[PDB]
Amino acid sequence: SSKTVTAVELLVRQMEAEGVSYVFGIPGGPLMPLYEAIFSRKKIQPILTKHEEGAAFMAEGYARVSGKLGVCCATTGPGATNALTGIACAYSDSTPVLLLTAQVGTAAFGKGALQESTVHGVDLVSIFSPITKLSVMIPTAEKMGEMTRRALRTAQSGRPGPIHLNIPADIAKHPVPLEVFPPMNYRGGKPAPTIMDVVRVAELIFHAKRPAILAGHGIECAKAWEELLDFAELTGIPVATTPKGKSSFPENHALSLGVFGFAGHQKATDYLLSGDVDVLIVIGSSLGDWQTNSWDPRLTPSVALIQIDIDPMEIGKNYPVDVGINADASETLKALILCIRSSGKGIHPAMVVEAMQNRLPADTILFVDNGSCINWGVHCYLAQTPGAFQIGLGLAAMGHAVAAAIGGKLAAPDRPVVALVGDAAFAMNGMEIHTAAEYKIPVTWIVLNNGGHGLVHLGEQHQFDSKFDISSFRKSIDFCKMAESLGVKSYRAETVEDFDAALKGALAMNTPCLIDVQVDIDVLPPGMKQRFD
Amino acid sequence: SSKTVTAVELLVRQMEAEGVSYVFGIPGGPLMPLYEAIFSRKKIQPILTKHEEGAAFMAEGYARVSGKLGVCCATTGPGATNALTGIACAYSDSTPVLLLTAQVGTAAFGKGALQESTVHGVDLVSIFSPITKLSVMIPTAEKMGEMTRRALRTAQSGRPGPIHLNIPADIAKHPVPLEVFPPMNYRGGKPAPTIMDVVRVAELIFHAKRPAILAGHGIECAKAWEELLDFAELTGIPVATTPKGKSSFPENHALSLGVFGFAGHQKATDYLLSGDVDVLIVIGSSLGDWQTNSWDPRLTPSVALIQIDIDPMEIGKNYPVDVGINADASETLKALILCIRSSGKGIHPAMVVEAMQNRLPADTILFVDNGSCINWGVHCYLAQTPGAFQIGLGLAAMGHAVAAAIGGKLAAPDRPVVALVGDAAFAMNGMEIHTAAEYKIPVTWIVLNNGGHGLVHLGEQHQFDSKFDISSFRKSIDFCKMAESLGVKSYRAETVEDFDAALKGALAMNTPCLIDVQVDIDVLPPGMKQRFD
Ligand SMILES: Nc1ncnc2c1ncn2[C@@H]1O[C@H](COP(=O)(O)OP(=O)(O)O)[C@@H](O)[C@H]1O
Ligand SMILES: Nc1ncnc2c1ncn2[C@@H]1O[C@H](COP(=O)(O)OP(=O)(O)O)[C@@H](O)[C@H]1O
Ligand SMILES: Cc1ncc(C[n+]2csc(CCOP(=O)(O)OP(=O)(O)O)c2C)c(N)n1
Ligand SMILES: Cc1ncc(C[n+]2csc(CCOP(=O)(O)OP(=O)(O)O)c2C)c(N)n1
Ligand SMILES: [Mg+2]
Ligand SMILES: [Mg+2]
């Protein structure tokens, strides 16, 4: 006969215990009980977005920067389906995002309820099943606690990923016992390497004449920046990153090879494909297409390929491994450090990036969209701070960075947050700067305004002999005016001097800002030629 | 040894035979062979949109207005997932929309390909399965013709609905035999009622003292407007429509009851729930929540319920039927006519709508979005022309009408096309007005700008005691400035006199136009109080 709360309040309180601070989303009729519970608790802050997709991107960005669980909510039917791309990006980047969706009342199942979201209508649980680690409808109020804890355990254990919890509106306000647990009670710790593997890796490094490390996005998921650095310095092993793993290692460090793979650096290409690397250590990379120059066989080391991954299904997928370590990257690096120590043995886009480099403070978190910004950002921007380069290459969704940067700023309010994005990507999700204006979230968007789809335009020229154009706008979008309409200060930049001033002004603001940069659509970005050939 | 074409060209030619005139979408690397084929044939025209969701909405609007198949295309991964909401609305409204998605080349399956869209990545085929009649990956170039015909047959047969065809990029340019068929060779006709059921309905009508017809959106799917009108006039039976079925029967006609159900008219409510209707004929309605005032038992007739539906699974779902006719609505009505004849026996939103009624030509196609616009359009606008009221109430996705109106105008270029939409819905998909500017598509958007989520705000007041606000913008969006930024002429209207002038100007343009109307968020729309109780 214990203390009761509503099922949806229990859910909110259990999220509190996980350190959730924001819920991104858009309300709707069957979702209102969740908002009622949030506003009654006055701890988690709801963020109203313009599109549920932007809500999901924001939760994804909040999660990646905070290292915590991101949470978004959407209503029945088209609310939840609008979130899908963002959940699919969290899925492809191994980001823990919880999507809470509403469901009609049980008494209306199979009758043609408004936005019915069951097997009889638009089956949200089945739609999200392929791109979540778990997609389930809460069957009864009594199971809310167990299912919530299950979702939280599943999102953040093993390879992190998103969760979809669907909540019938009548279940939401049923009374349940107030049963909230600390996170350590309902999820376990991280896997470590075996003693044998540590000793074998140590020995391989001791005898290696040209070892190398390829560090991927798993370094960020494992929060292993300081261990990777210590390990690299203790051994003298040079470190390349994958494109998405950029900022896992300080690119100004003497041991940094830069980025290997798409839009990468000749320094890394020469070191890793020259045939001289005898021991290659892959840490937290899935070794997909862009990470390997389309599975280039020259990546194969001459003595041993060591691959460290928390997901056992990634080990040896595309390259045969000699030491396949199923463990968390941070636990592995710590063990390796323990073993080795104890032993004792328009404007040219490049100018834009350069100008950004000269003005952005060192602690800036840089979000980069998908488009030619990828090449310019990955290739030309020097990332010195751990985790400060945020790019969603798993799915490479246009508009991801446009919205994710807002969630990032909420996760790191003390740090400058800048997003480098294309104009077509900004047309997809740029309305979200209104969300930044509404909540006074200071982010700076730099729009490479080349009047259309640059990467597609170059593909038409280089692969289809300019036979057709389905990439250039007849009239460019005026982002300054668009920003103005959404209540966000803006600057237009047609020269480097103009850009430098704009950036300078933007950084000093305590509100959001947009910089519309004039850029030529014909400019060939770094690495695209090789990619075309 | 007969002529061969590429698989993707075969697909384009087979869509030509179905009368497809536009393909809405956004290009991407694996999708480019489709665009190459389209541009080489110069009959189907590609329409570049701002978001793949807007492309799916446009295909949906094109399909509903044209009575033909709508086609949208998206690239791998996030391109396709961005379309999902629009496809889900086609599914909920029984609209034939074909979504063509690209897939990576087969040689990269399971290796971590860029935007890999297989079971090993983001599994598009399984994601779309719940909201399509068919979702399949073309396994070989040789099967392109059969799979295409299968898709076209499936979309437009039985209860119409959307299809997802996923095309591996390497298959796209393999040679295949040039084999194109007219639609009648690979899909059949419509089913008719049995003579026994026709005679039974005729007898029930001949003896009925207070008959009524409730006509739904199936009337449009069957293109049965003239047969419905002739049937009602022949029998003297008054006709109500469902909300979504509005414009299936001329609302100025002496036999019109108006709309029954959500935001409907008292005339229809009095007639149908009085208990005096003895024979009720439901034609092409799924009898969901809004169609039945939450399955009101008083809708039950006292003698006989007759239900006509092409989908046998809808017949008798929520109300027991006495005559359940599985047939096309147009074939059934023609049969009934043949039998009976042979026998021989801010600004207040209501003022906005009145001004629209006071200027719009009779042939105007009115798209109404989802939001309080539903209530104002359904209740206050008098629809006289068959099919000229276009509302997507199956899923009621915000932003649907914003984009669907562009496809509608392309389907009926000689007719005025106007969209009545809320400001939050325009923030979700309003960027598509740049698509209308790019192609010079004259559509008029009327934005009810109440500075936030009107229906949600009223729900907070009437169901949650104004305890919280997650609905009002701190600073409303300036849609005239946004339109200007996107190259679209615009007007701001704060009085009915300004609005009338704006509409007049808008109708005379041969370019798109946006009208930003000041509206009080507090006004209670017709039918809301009833829904609240
Ligand atoms: N905590 C962790 N420790 C080690 N590996 C991890 C951890 N979290 C995620 N991973 C792994 O890191 C990899 C990330 O791959 P991906 O997201 O494709 O980035 P990249 O583009 O750098 O390969 C996955 O193979 C995943 O299993
Ligand atoms: N050609 C047709 N003839 C008869 N009924 C049809 C036809 N096409 C679709 N239908 C039916 O019309 C109904 C449409 O229901 P719905 O889209 O919910 O509209 P409404 O809101 O008017 O009920 C479905 O039950 C579908 O099976
Ligand atoms: C949602 C989505 N649709 C399509 C693509 C395919 N795509 C990759 S780059 C590109 C063009 C991006 O244009 P813009 O953002 O203006 O950048 P630019 O390359 O011109 O700098 C497109 C459509 C994608 N990645 N995501
Ligand atoms: C994609 C989507 N998200 C959420 C909802 C829930 N919803 C119904 S009405 C409404 C408010 C719409 O606001 P606006 O378009 O400005 O219209 P208003 O009611 O203020 O006229 C919302 C969010 C929805 N129907 N579709
Ligand atoms: Mg561009
Ligand atoms: Mg509104």
Tab-separated table of N, CA and C in Angstrom, chain A residues 380-476:
chain	number	residue	atom	x	y	z
A	380	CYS	N	40.833	20.327	-43.511
A	380	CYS	CA	41.497	21.607	-43.278
A	380	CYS	C	41.454	22.070	-41.838
A	381	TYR	N	40.527	21.575	-41.037
A	381	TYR	CA	40.404	22.055	-39.673
A	381	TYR	C	41.305	21.234	-38.766
A	382	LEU	N	42.106	21.915	-37.955
A	382	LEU	CA	42.975	21.224	-37.017
A	382	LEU	C	42.266	21.123	-35.672
A	383	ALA	N	41.967	19.898	-35.259
A	383	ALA	CA	41.251	19.632	-34.018
A	383	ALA	C	42.269	19.311	-32.932
A	384	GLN	N	42.308	20.143	-31.888
A	384	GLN	CA	43.255	19.950	-30.803
A	384	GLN	C	42.587	19.482	-29.526
A	385	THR	N	41.303	19.680	-29.395
A	385	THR	CA	40.695	19.405	-28.109
A	385	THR	C	39.916	18.105	-28.176
A	386	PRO	N	39.995	17.302	-27.113
A	386	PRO	CA	39.343	15.985	-27.129
A	386	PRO	C	37.854	16.096	-27.412
A	387	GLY	N	37.404	15.371	-28.430
A	387	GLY	CA	35.978	15.310	-28.678
A	387	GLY	C	35.345	16.575	-29.215
A	388	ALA	N	36.133	17.583	-29.582
A	388	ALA	CA	35.583	18.865	-30.004
A	388	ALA	C	35.231	18.923	-31.492
A	389	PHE	N	35.353	17.818	-32.224
A	389	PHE	CA	34.962	17.755	-33.631
A	389	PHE	C	33.794	16.780	-33.754
A	390	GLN	N	32.606	17.300	-34.103
A	390	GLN	CA	31.356	16.535	-34.053
A	390	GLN	C	30.770	16.407	-35.456
A	391	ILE	N	30.937	15.236	-36.029
A	391	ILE	CA	30.450	14.919	-37.351
A	391	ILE	C	29.734	13.575	-37.342
A	392	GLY	N	28.569	13.507	-37.946
A	392	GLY	CA	27.745	12.308	-37.974
A	392	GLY	C	27.843	11.545	-39.267
A	393	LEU	N	28.967	10.886	-39.437
A	393	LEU	CA	29.245	10.182	-40.643
A	393	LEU	C	28.671	8.791	-40.727
A	394	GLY	N	28.204	8.223	-39.625
A	394	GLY	CA	27.600	6.905	-39.708
A	394	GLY	C	26.503	6.871	-40.754
A	395	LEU	N	25.561	7.807	-40.665
A	395	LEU	CA	24.520	7.926	-41.676
A	395	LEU	C	24.699	9.141	-42.585
A	396	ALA	N	25.497	10.128	-42.173
A	396	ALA	CA	25.803	11.293	-43.004
A	396	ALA	C	24.521	11.949	-43.519
A	397	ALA	N	23.620	12.246	-42.590
A	397	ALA	CA	22.345	12.863	-42.929
A	397	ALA	C	22.519	14.375	-43.071
A	398	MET	N	22.121	14.935	-44.215
A	398	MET	CA	22.115	16.387	-44.340
A	398	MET	C	21.210	16.989	-43.280
A	399	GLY	N	21.679	18.075	-42.657
A	399	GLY	CA	20.925	18.759	-41.632
A	399	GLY	C	21.204	18.290	-40.218
A	400	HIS	N	21.864	17.136	-40.054
A	400	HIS	CA	22.191	16.613	-38.727
A	400	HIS	C	22.887	17.668	-37.880
A	401	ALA	N	23.988	18.230	-38.390
A	401	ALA	CA	24.746	19.199	-37.603
A	401	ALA	C	23.947	20.475	-37.370
A	402	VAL	N	23.121	20.878	-38.343
A	402	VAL	CA	22.318	22.096	-38.193
A	402	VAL	C	21.579	22.082	-36.863
A	403	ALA	N	20.923	20.963	-36.544
A	403	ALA	CA	20.172	20.886	-35.295
A	403	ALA	C	21.012	20.341	-34.138
A	404	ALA	N	21.881	19.360	-34.395
A	404	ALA	CA	22.638	18.759	-33.294
A	404	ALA	C	23.436	19.799	-32.511
A	405	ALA	N	23.906	20.862	-33.175
A	405	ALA	CA	24.727	21.856	-32.484
A	405	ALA	C	23.984	22.501	-31.321
A	406	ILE	N	22.661	22.616	-31.416
A	406	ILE	CA	21.894	23.204	-30.322
A	406	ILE	C	21.923	22.297	-29.100
A	407	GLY	N	21.758	20.988	-29.310
A	407	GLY	CA	21.866	20.055	-28.205
A	407	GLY	C	23.261	20.052	-27.620
A	408	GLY	N	24.271	20.157	-28.482
A	408	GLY	CA	25.633	20.223	-27.996
A	408	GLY	C	25.867	21.418	-27.096
A	409	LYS	N	25.348	22.587	-27.489
A	409	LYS	CA	25.552	23.781	-26.670
A	409	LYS	C	24.866	23.629	-25.319
A	410	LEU	N	23.689	22.993	-25.293
A	410	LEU	CA	23.022	22.743	-24.017
A	410	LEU	C	23.825	21.778	-23.159
A	411	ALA	N	24.592	20.884	-23.782
A	411	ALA	CA	25.408	19.958	-23.004
A	411	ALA	C	26.668	20.624	-22.486
A	412	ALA	N	27.173	21.625	-23.198
A	412	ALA	CA	28.426	22.299	-22.858
A	412	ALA	C	28.212	23.805	-22.929
A	413	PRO	N	27.408	24.359	-22.020
A	413	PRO	CA	27.001	25.765	-22.165
A	413	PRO	C	28.150	26.741	-21.994
A	414	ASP	N	29.222	26.317	-21.355
A	414	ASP	CA	30.411	27.127	-21.122
A	414	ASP	C	31.354	27.173	-22.318
A	415	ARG	N	31.096	26.410	-23.362
A	415	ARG	CA	32.031	26.327	-24.467
A	415	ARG	C	31.422	26.901	-25.750
A	416	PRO	N	32.238	27.492	-26.629
A	416	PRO	CA	31.703	27.984	-27.903
A	416	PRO	C	31.302	26.815	-28.782
A	417	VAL	N	30.165	26.958	-29.453
A	417	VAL	CA	29.675	25.907	-30.329
A	417	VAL	C	29.420	26.513	-31.693
A	418	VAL	N	30.033	25.931	-32.712
A	418	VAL	CA	29.932	26.422	-34.074
A	418	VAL	C	29.581	25.255	-34.980
A	419	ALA	N	28.709	25.512	-35.946
A	419	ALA	CA	28.303	24.504	-36.905
A	419	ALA	C	28.680	24.983	-38.295
A	420	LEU	N	29.367	24.141	-39.037
A	420	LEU	CA	29.741	24.448	-40.409
A	420	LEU	C	28.866	23.578	-41.301
A	421	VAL	N	27.991	24.212	-42.088
A	421	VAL	CA	26.934	23.499	-42.799
A	421	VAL	C	26.733	24.105	-44.181
A	422	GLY	N	26.224	23.280	-45.101
A	422	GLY	CA	25.869	23.737	-46.428
A	422	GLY	C	24.468	24.351	-46.497
A	423	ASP	N	24.209	25.050	-47.613
A	423	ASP	CA	22.932	25.744	-47.770
A	423	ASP	C	21.783	24.771	-48.006
A	424	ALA	N	21.995	23.716	-48.801
A	424	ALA	CA	20.915	22.747	-48.968
A	424	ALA	C	20.608	22.050	-47.650
A	425	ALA	N	21.642	21.714	-46.872
A	425	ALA	CA	21.397	21.116	-45.560
A	425	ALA	C	20.683	22.100	-44.639
A	426	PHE	N	21.007	23.384	-44.747
A	426	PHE	CA	20.316	24.362	-43.921
A	426	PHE	C	18.855	24.514	-44.333
A	427	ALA	N	18.543	24.369	-45.622
A	427	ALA	CA	17.138	24.360	-46.026
A	427	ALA	C	16.394	23.153	-45.466
A	428	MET	N	17.101	22.090	-45.125
A	428	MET	CA	16.392	20.926	-44.618
A	428	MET	C	15.991	21.101	-43.157
A	429	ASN	N	16.872	21.662	-42.316
A	429	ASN	CA	16.612	21.714	-40.880
A	429	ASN	C	16.933	23.072	-40.253
A	430	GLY	N	17.213	24.094	-41.061
A	430	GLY	CA	17.619	25.385	-40.530
A	430	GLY	C	16.542	26.106	-39.754
A	431	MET	N	15.281	25.706	-39.912
A	431	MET	CA	14.237	26.336	-39.110
A	431	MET	C	14.534	26.217	-37.624
A	432	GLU	N	15.363	25.244	-37.222
A	432	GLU	CA	15.645	25.047	-35.802
A	432	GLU	C	16.405	26.198	-35.172
A	433	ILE	N	16.995	27.104	-35.960
A	433	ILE	CA	17.609	28.258	-35.321
A	433	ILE	C	16.547	29.070	-34.596
A	434	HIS	N	15.279	28.915	-34.972
A	434	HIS	CA	14.234	29.561	-34.188
A	434	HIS	C	14.175	28.976	-32.783
A	435	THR	N	14.405	27.673	-32.664
A	435	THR	CA	14.491	27.048	-31.352
A	435	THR	C	15.642	27.632	-30.549
A	436	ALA	N	16.794	27.817	-31.188
A	436	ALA	CA	17.913	28.446	-30.493
A	436	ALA	C	17.558	29.863	-30.064
A	437	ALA	N	16.844	30.605	-30.919
A	437	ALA	CA	16.427	31.957	-30.546
A	437	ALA	C	15.454	31.924	-29.375
A	438	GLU	N	14.474	31.024	-29.434
A	438	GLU	CA	13.465	30.953	-28.386
A	438	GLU	C	14.103	30.728	-27.021
A	439	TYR	N	15.088	29.839	-26.937
A	439	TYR	CA	15.684	29.511	-25.649
A	439	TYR	C	17.004	30.238	-25.394
A	440	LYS	N	17.401	31.175	-26.263
A	440	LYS	CA	18.641	31.940	-26.067
A	440	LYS	C	19.859	31.016	-25.983
A	441	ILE	N	19.974	30.101	-26.942
A	441	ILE	CA	21.065	29.126	-26.976
A	441	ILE	C	22.118	29.656	-27.943
A	442	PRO	N	23.286	30.119	-27.469
A	442	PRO	CA	24.239	30.761	-28.387
A	442	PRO	C	25.052	29.779	-29.214
A	443	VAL	N	24.602	29.556	-30.442
A	443	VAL	CA	25.315	28.742	-31.417
A	443	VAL	C	25.581	29.621	-32.627
A	444	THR	N	26.697	29.373	-33.305
A	444	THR	CA	26.998	30.075	-34.543
A	444	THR	C	26.987	29.085	-35.702
A	445	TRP	N	26.072	29.301	-36.653
A	445	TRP	CA	26.036	28.550	-37.901
A	445	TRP	C	26.798	29.316	-38.978
A	446	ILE	N	27.711	28.628	-39.643
A	446	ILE	CA	28.420	29.139	-40.806
A	446	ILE	C	27.906	28.360	-42.009
A	447	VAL	N	27.139	29.031	-42.871
A	447	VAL	CA	26.513	28.397	-44.026
A	447	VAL	C	27.382	28.632	-45.255
A	448	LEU	N	27.899	27.547	-45.824
A	448	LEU	CA	28.617	27.614	-47.092
A	448	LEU	C	27.566	27.732	-48.181
A	449	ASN	N	27.261	28.963	-48.561
A	449	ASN	CA	26.160	29.203	-49.484
A	449	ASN	C	26.707	29.200	-50.907
A	450	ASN	N	26.708	28.021	-51.527
A	450	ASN	CA	27.112	27.881	-52.919
A	450	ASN	C	25.920	27.719	-53.860
A	451	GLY	N	24.722	28.091	-53.415
A	451	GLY	CA	23.528	28.059	-54.257
A	451	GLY	C	23.123	26.689	-54.767
A	452	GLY	N	23.223	25.659	-53.936
A	452	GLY	CA	22.721	24.365	-54.345
A	452	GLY	C	23.565	23.241	-53.783
A	453	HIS	N	23.491	22.087	-54.450
A	453	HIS	CA	24.068	20.832	-53.955
A	453	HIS	C	25.449	20.645	-54.575
A	454	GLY	N	26.466	21.205	-53.914
A	454	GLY	CA	27.826	21.182	-54.417
A	454	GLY	C	28.352	19.799	-54.752
A	455	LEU	N	28.298	18.875	-53.791
A	455	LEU	CA	28.828	17.541	-54.056
A	455	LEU	C	28.108	16.881	-55.222
A	456	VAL	N	26.798	17.103	-55.352
A	456	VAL	CA	26.082	16.514	-56.481
A	456	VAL	C	26.487	17.211	-57.770
A	457	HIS	N	26.620	18.543	-57.723
A	457	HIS	CA	27.079	19.296	-58.888
A	457	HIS	C	28.415	18.769	-59.399
A	458	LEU	N	29.355	18.513	-58.491
A	458	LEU	CA	30.649	17.999	-58.927
A	458	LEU	C	30.518	16.594	-59.496
A	459	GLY	N	29.632	15.779	-58.924
A	459	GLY	CA	29.388	14.460	-59.487
A	459	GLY	C	28.856	14.510	-60.912
A	460	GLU	N	27.950	15.455	-61.197
A	460	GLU	CA	27.446	15.607	-62.564
A	460	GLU	C	28.575	15.927	-63.540
A	461	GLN	N	29.518	16.783	-63.125
A	461	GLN	CA	30.632	17.165	-63.995
A	461	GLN	C	31.638	16.029	-64.158
A	462	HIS	N	31.997	15.407	-63.070
A	462	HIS	CA	33.015	14.408	-63.074
A	462	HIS	C	32.593	13.012	-63.366
A	463	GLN	N	31.318	12.720	-63.295
A	463	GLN	CA	30.910	11.381	-63.576
A	463	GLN	C	29.906	11.301	-64.664
A	464	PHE	N	29.192	12.361	-64.911
A	464	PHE	CA	28.183	12.327	-65.933
A	464	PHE	C	28.410	13.367	-67.031
A	465	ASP	N	29.637	13.841	-67.171
A	465	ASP	CA	30.023	14.781	-68.212
A	465	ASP	C	29.153	16.016	-68.385
A	466	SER	N	28.659	16.581	-67.294
A	466	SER	CA	27.764	17.725	-67.292
A	466	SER	C	26.506	17.606	-68.147
A	467	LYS	N	25.970	16.407	-68.292
A	467	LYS	CA	24.822	16.156	-69.107
A	467	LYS	C	23.530	16.678	-68.566
A	468	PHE	N	23.457	16.916	-67.274
A	468	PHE	CA	22.256	17.420	-66.647
A	468	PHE	C	22.606	18.099	-65.349
A	469	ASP	N	21.727	18.956	-64.895
A	469	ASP	CA	21.921	19.655	-63.663
A	469	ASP	C	20.678	19.545	-62.835
A	470	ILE	N	20.792	18.878	-61.717
A	470	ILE	CA	19.704	18.784	-60.782
A	470	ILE	C	20.261	19.175	-59.433
A	471	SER	N	21.207	20.086	-59.422
A	471	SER	CA	21.880	20.491	-58.227
A	471	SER	C	21.963	21.958	-57.948
A	472	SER	N	21.897	22.790	-58.956
A	472	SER	CA	21.991	24.202	-58.746
A	472	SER	C	20.673	24.894	-58.625
A	473	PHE	N	20.532	25.739	-57.647
A	473	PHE	CA	19.335	26.499	-57.526
A	473	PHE	C	19.352	27.602	-58.587
A	474	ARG	N	18.189	27.993	-59.048
A	474	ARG	CA	18.060	29.068	-59.971
A	474	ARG	C	18.226	30.353	-59.178
A	475	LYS	N	17.793	30.356	-57.939
A	475	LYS	CA	18.009	31.490	-57.105
A	475	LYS	C	18.444	31.047	-55.724
A	476	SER	N	19.615	31.475	-55.313
A	476	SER	CA	20.167	31.207	-54.010
A	476	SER	C	19.295	31.681	-52.888
